[PDB]
Each structure stands twice: as C-alpha cells, then as structure tokens.
From Swiss-Prot:
Residues 1-141, 144-277, 283-421, 425-565, 566-686 form the MRH domain. Binds HA-I and HA-II plasma membrane adapters. Interacts with DPP4; the interaction is direct. Binds GGA1, GGA2 and GGA3. Interacts with the heterotrimeric retromer cargo-selective complex (CSC), formed by VPS26 (VPS26A or VPS26B), VPS29 and VPS35; which is involved in retrograde trafficking of the receptor from endosomes to the Golgi apparatus. This is Cation-independent mannose-6-phosphate receptor. Its main location: Golgi. Belongs to the MRL1/IGF2R family. The chain holds residues 934 to 1646 of 2491 of the full protein. Disulfide bonds join 1-37, 43-54, 104-139, 146-187, 196-204, 235-263, 248-275, 285-320, 328-340, 377-407, 391-419, 427-466, 478-485, 518-551, 533-563, 567-601, 607-614, 643-674, 654-686. GO terms for cellular component: cell surface; clathrin coat; clathrin-coated endocytic vesicle membrane; early endosome; endocytic vesicle; endosome; endosome membrane; extracellular exosome. It comes from Homo sapiens (Human). Glycans are attached at residues 18, 24, 304, 370. GO terms for molecular function: D-mannose binding; enzyme binding; G-protein alpha-subunit binding; identical protein binding; insulin-like growth factor binding; insulin-like growth factor II binding; insulin-like growth factor receptor activity; phosphoprotein binding.
Amino acid sequence: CSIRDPNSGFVFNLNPLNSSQGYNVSGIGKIFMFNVCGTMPVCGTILGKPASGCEAETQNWKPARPVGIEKSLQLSTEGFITLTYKGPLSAKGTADAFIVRFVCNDDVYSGPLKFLHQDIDSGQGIRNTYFEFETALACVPSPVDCQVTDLAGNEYDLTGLSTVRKPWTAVDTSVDGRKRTFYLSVCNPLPYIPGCQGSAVGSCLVSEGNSWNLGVVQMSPQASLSIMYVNGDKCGNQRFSTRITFECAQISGSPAFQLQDGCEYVFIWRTVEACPVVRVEGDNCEVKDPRHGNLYDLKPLGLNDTIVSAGEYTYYFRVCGKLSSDVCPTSDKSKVVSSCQEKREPQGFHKVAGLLTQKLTYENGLLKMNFTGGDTCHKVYQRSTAIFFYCDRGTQRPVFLKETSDCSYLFEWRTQYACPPFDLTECSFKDGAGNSFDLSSLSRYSDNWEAITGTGDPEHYLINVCKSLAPQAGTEPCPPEAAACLLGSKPVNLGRVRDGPQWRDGIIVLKYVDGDLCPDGIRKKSTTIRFTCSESQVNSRPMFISAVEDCEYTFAWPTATACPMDCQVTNPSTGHLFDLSSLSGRAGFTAAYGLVYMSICGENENCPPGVGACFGISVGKANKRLRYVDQVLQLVYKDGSPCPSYKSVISFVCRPEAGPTNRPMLISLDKQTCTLFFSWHTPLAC
Ligand SMILES: *[C@@H]1O[C@H](CO)[C@@H](O[C@@H]2O[C@H](CO)[C@@H](O[C@@H]3O[C@H](CO)[C@@H](O)[C@H](O[C@H]4O[C@H](CO)[C@@H](O)[C@H](O)[C@@H]4O[C@H]4O[C@H](CO)[C@@H](O)[C@H](O)[C@@H]4O[C@H]4O[C@H](CO)[C@@H](O)[C@H](O)[C@@H]4O)[C@@H]3O)[C@H](O)[C@H]2NC(C)=O)[C@H](O)[C@H]1NC(C)=O
Ligand SMILES: *[C@@H]1O[C@H](CO)[C@@H](O)[C@H](O)[C@H]1NC(C)=O
C-alpha cells in the first residue's frame, strides 16, 4: 500500500500495519473492523476472496457489509493519505466503501483509530463510512523530539546520544569475509556520510562501496527504551528497518549490532543516557539523595579557603562561604566574593570568579555547585565557578578542569562528603605460603561492577569488591547496605560486607552475608565471589554462576588482580616469563675494552666477593631485582668503588638465533654518574 508525496518525494509504506487481530471501533450502535495492507479473515469471503473489512452489532458470529474487493490508496487535495476499501456491487451500480485517513503522530505507531461519521445514501444503496488512524508512518521523514516519559512517570532524554561530534557506529564481520560499518543516529538524521543522505536517514550500512538506508527518522522513542527506524530502501518485497533497544547502564556506551531478523537490523545500546532523569536543588550547602534518602552536607569543605594552582593563574574559593584571602578586594554593594582568579606577575591581575551561594544541585547522581555573578569577560558574560563533586574514600583537593567559552571555571572534587553511607573491608590477604594478594584495585567508589550473565537475561547483577555498592543510576536503587544486588520486581540485597577475602579450599573467596530474607523466611541471602588468577583478564568482569534456592548466590571472576604479588621476571602485558638463571655463575664472562669481568644474578671470582662486575675496581654489587622494560630485561649493579658510586646497567635484548659471539658488550660509560651500560643479544629474551 505505497504512495509518493509530490511536495516531499518520499515513498510512504503502510506495509508494517498488516496485523492479525486487525483494528476494531464502535459508533452508530455497531462495530467497524478492518486490517491494513492485509486481509481480515474474520467476516471474510467477498466472492471467494478474503475481505479486508467488516461491520456487526454486539454486546457476534454474523458479519455485514463485507468490504475489500476494490482497495485504493492516494493523496487528496490537502496532500493527506487516504485508503478506500470498496466492497461488492450491492445494487444501483454502487458499492459500500470504507474511507480511512492516515494522520501524522510522531509519538505513536498504530495510534488510536477513531470512527468519524458515515454518509448514508439509501437512494443509491451506498452506506459509505469514514475513519481516522493516527500513525508515525504518515509523518514525512524529519528530525524528532528526543525526550520520553514511561507509563510509571519516569522522564528520560536521549539528546546526549544525538549531540555528539562523532557519528555512532557498530562494526561487525562474519566467521570469514563480510565487513560492514553501521551508522546510527538518535532522533536526528545521520551526519553527512558519502552514499548515505536521502531525506532523514537514521541507520545506514556501508560495505564494499554500497550504502543502504536501513530506516528513516520517523517515530519518537518509546518506553526500558526503544527506537525503530523503518521505510529504508527495498529488501526483496519489503523495505529495510532498524530496531535499537536502549538499556540503562553505568557507561557512556556505543550501539552494538545484535542480529538481523528478515529486513530489520536489531541493535542493543547499553548507555547512561537511557537512565531516568531525576534532579534536585538544595540550599544551606545540603541536598537530599532521591534514591538512597541520605543528606549530602558539603559544609565541612568550607572550613578553609581552597587554593588550586593552574599554569600561571591561581584560584581561591571558599565552599559555601566568604573568601578570607587578601586577594580580589570587593566589599562594595551586596556582593560577597567566593571565587578569585589571580594571574601571578608578570602582566598579572585579580578577577572575581564567583559570588556566595549555598545552593547544592544533584543532577542524575552528580553533585554540582555554581558560584555566579563574577567580573565581566568577553563584554557579555559574568565569570562563574562550578565544582563537580564525586563520591571517593578520602576528601582530596579539587582539580582544575577548564574555563568554558562563557568563563565558567570548572573543578572536579572527589570527596567522601559526596558519598552515601558505605561499608569497607581490608582487601589484601596472604595464603598458606605467605604470597601477597591485593584485590583493592577492583573496589569502585563512583560505580559498580555489572555481572556477566546470559545475553537475554531479564535480571542484572551489581557487585563491588571489599565495599558496599556505590550509588547506581536509575529510580530503582539497591538497599544501601548491599555489596551485591539483583535488578525483576524489586531491588534484592544479596549480602552485606563482613569479612575480607580468604584462601578457602585452595581458592580466593569473598563472602557477603545477611542480605534479604530467603524464601523459607528463616535465612538471609548470601553471596560468594570465587576469584581465579588469570594474567590475560586485565579488565575482566564477574560472571554470575548460580543461585541455589533464591538464598545462596555464587559469582566467578577470572582476573589478573587475583595473582600473587629464581632470576625470572614476567612481561606485565603478555605474561611470558623470562628466566636469566641459565646464564648465571661465579664463572661469569668478559666484555671488550683492557677487559671487563662480570657475572649475572650472582658474584664474580675476579672481583671482591659480592661484587657483580669489575676491571683492572668494583663497578657494582651482585643483586636479584630483574625488571622487564620495553621488551628488554634489565639488571642494575649499584654501590661500586668511589666515582672519580660506580654502577653497571645490563640490558638483555631478543635475538632469535644464538650468534657466533654471544657475550655481553659494554655500550656506554657515563662519566657524569660513573654508570657502565651493557647490552646482551640472547635468544633467552624472546
Ligand atoms: C554557572 O552559572 C552561570 C550562570 O548560570 C552559567 O553561565 C551562563 O551560561 C549561559 C549558557 O547557557 C549563558 O547564557 C547565554 O547568554 C549568551 C549571551 O550571549 C547568549 O548568547 C546565549 O545564547 C545562545 O543561545 C540562545 C538560545 O538558544 C540564542 O538565542 C543565542 O543566540 C545563543 O545561541 C547559541 O549558542 C547556544 C549555546 O550557547 C547554541 O546552542 C546555539 O546553537 C547558538 O549557537 C550559535 O552562537 C554561538 C555563540 O553564541 C556559537 O557558539 C554557535 O556556533 C552559533 O554561532 C546564552 O543565552 C550566560 O551568559 C552565562 N552567564 C553569564 C553571566 O553570562 C554557567 O553555565 C554555569 N556553569 C555551569 C556548570 O552550568
Ligand atoms: C499479512 O500478515 C499475515 C499474518 O500476519 C501474513 O500471513 C501475510 O503474508 C501478510 N500479508 C501481506 C499482504 O503482507
């Protein structure tokens, strides 16, 4: 059922509206039903044909005025889209008609079908009936409002995704061969891409110098969140479509190509923009958290003037208070200075950077302060000072970020004062052998770990290491005491922090306890994290393993962190262990000069005992601290004879074949530091 707008040049398709339940509405004491670009087998059979529309009176097996033998679709005088189902020639040479108009609504897809009126010419036996059908398919390809509300009343905004300077893209290749780059836009047309322009192209595939428009910017986002772009260029008998499913997540994600269902390309987009927008203003330097319920109080940060240095300038500000420092002098009028830029001489001056304010704003889990009303910059702008507060264990000094185009001076401050109540545990332990383990690097204060489960899993798992969870984005927050959490019906506490990690039956176990009540109503849920040493897993995530009787939850985590902290050293990136013990020995070797005697990993029989190298005079004591640096193995022999302290740096370099003269060579003598630099090309370094 497809037509062209002469004003627009767009190809409209109502194809997607073929449905099976069809569409059914009341009026004039009877119910009118039909389907679109499809049949309505209920009340069918005009001749032997299945009928597109019907009529009946009810509340009914019996149909009436079956219609759909002559189907017609066209633009009227307005340039508005009309579909006519004419039925059979009853009498007097005229057929019963259904006339249905398609009216643009960006916000809905198969939007309310309302009966309008019917014209009754009894004289000519034509009972002609008139309908309106709201759809986004009627809308000409144009940019869309990118703000959404769900039925629960949570507001979102995906404008973040559309405002980017770069075009979002998902690359995807097959087992061998196929290589393609998906361009996605949100609510706005794609940026200029060679081969993809059309009218309002939302998703585009480029492969082998062929571009495909896989959906036009048509319908607004729907509520988790979804967008569909439809009416892309021909795919056999159909036209291409793209579905993007948004999911609320800690990261600023990219859209990831998931699968292809006929002519529809489906993507999953895990991003922070998809998270319910909730924002709150406070005064008296305090603000209440809408999710947890706790009160942030930043008054403690204002008990002294805060000084931050930048390049040549130096910034003074007092949190929620008047500056005490003898700079930017201004008491005149009703202006209380809270922020000052001082450019130190030369060509230095003092500029007021912000006035007193005790307003603390909370915007989607960030705390902000803006000191306004400063000295004029760029004729029209008043200098302002913004501080962004993030949760952290200790309240460290703020750091200068940048000056905006409107002379807003931006500061980040990670401080515990921005952190809800939170439990903490010692995260280093030792095994039976005395090897050191420290998982403290996996403790996250601003975010949490998202567990890896199955790809369709309706539930997500949040975990932190050796502490209770950081605050989470959304309006369904976990109980504050939880260190692990389940996110179905309600947020489920899976366990609180009690003890640190322990070597239990030859594996690293972290146990959280006293979560929500188990279904039997006598026990409380507990979580076990089983850590397994894996050098390659450097950014790894915990994999959810099992949930026994909705009571015992178990995760596994292969990670490089869980690994223990003899002339051998490990490549920190690959894990290949280089052993230089096979070269050691009191016997040792000589390097060209006069000569130089030296032994590695051990002492030499020509020098004083305990000295690694000498000539004749000690040039360094033997030692065992081997470093891997820049694909080279390195020893430093220090504390030698007096420098007219002599020292020897020995560097081992990869050589796939053992050369005809495979002995170390003195490559430098630094006279300013009395340092002897040796290089040795040996197959042992590969
Ligand atoms: C801490 O608090 C202070 C106080 O709240 C905040 O500082 C303020 O920042 C405001 C920006 O939101 C700024 O308002 C601006 O007033 C200027 C005066 O010239 C006005 O030009 C700005 O107007 C822009 O937008 C309006 C409405 O759309 C337009 O009518 C106007 O022509 C300007 O349009 C352009 O810039 C917009 C963004 O600024 C663009 O969206 C828009 O596309 C358009 O771009 C064109 O012109 C731009 C140059 O102006 C150019 O970059 C672009 O290429 C195009 O050529 C706006 O009303 C306040 O002036 C400022 N406070 C003071 C004292 O001046 C500060 O943000 C706070 N810090 C934090 C953390 O928020
Ligand atoms: C309409 O959809 C029905 C059922 O959903 C399917 O059997 C049929 O092939 C579709 N027909 C057209 C005209 O697209």
